[PDB]
Ligand binder design. Sequence first.
Ligand code: FES
Ligand code: FES
Ligand SMILES: [Cl-]
Lengths: 160, 166
Amino acid sequence: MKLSGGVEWALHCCVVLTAASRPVPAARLAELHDVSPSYLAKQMQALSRAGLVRSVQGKTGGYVLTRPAVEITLLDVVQAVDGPDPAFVCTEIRQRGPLATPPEKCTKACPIARAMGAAEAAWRASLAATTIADLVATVDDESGPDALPGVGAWLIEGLG
Amino acid sequence: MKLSGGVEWALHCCVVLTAASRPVPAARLAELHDVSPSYLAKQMQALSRAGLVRSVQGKTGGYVLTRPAVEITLLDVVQAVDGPDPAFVCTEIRQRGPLATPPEKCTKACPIARAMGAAEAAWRASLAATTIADLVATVDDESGPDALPGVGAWLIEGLGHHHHHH
Ligand code: FES
Ligand code: FES
Ligand SMILES: [Cl-]
């Protein structure tokens, strides 16, 4: 199964933005992670279209989270970058060939499609149960309480 | 996310092979699902490499399941076709840039990596909990108990006849 390569970068960007007390340009986030500015901007633009970040305009501008970290799930961020479409796409092959499912018996989804859907629901539910706030609390505990504030200070420095 | 297109066909083939009392050629499975025999043979070869089917040789050969339906999970079939590699691969981006987390504090996997790994473990656990036998029981209930036996009869009908009239 393939997942958008943007997900790692986008989740890291959401975590460090919680520590920024002012808007952070995409270029500064890109410098932090030593990644293509253009590539990271595309991920921030996907987060913007999903209403998770807002681009504040001006030379004092850059990205901010649109709501508290506790209200942003990992599923919110992953679906922003990877998309909401199901991984398993049923193309109704049960309706093909000489012993095709009777048309009146196609009101329920294929049992195979339903089983694949249940697995995707388990993946989504796992991501929905964790927030950016949860990731921050883990980083505080594992890296220490000054790790993310240090990143935050670095991200906003030179602006004020 | 995105799964290999062969998965839908492969799962359907495993279900209908439970109803067949003799080997079923890829071309006969392909006729049942109205699909290119070469395309379907590619999916059956993936199932063969994973040890889930065997291609029996000779005039009355074809594919057979290698163990009972209750011993074949959806995860077995999906990994056979789509592959076992994780969807999310951590590339240790925490170890990049001017504030890079040094290895000393990288004794554990990144919290983000652990969360993504937990979600994939949940997807795998769901697919591992359902067998081909479970799908057959659902079909028996929803299509009626003659549906899959009828498919099995059709799949084995007139096998070994390859010299068709001009
Ligand atoms: S018709 Fe699509 S999974 Fe069965
Ligand atoms: S370093 Fe890879 S997910 Fe955080
Ligand atoms: Cl916050």
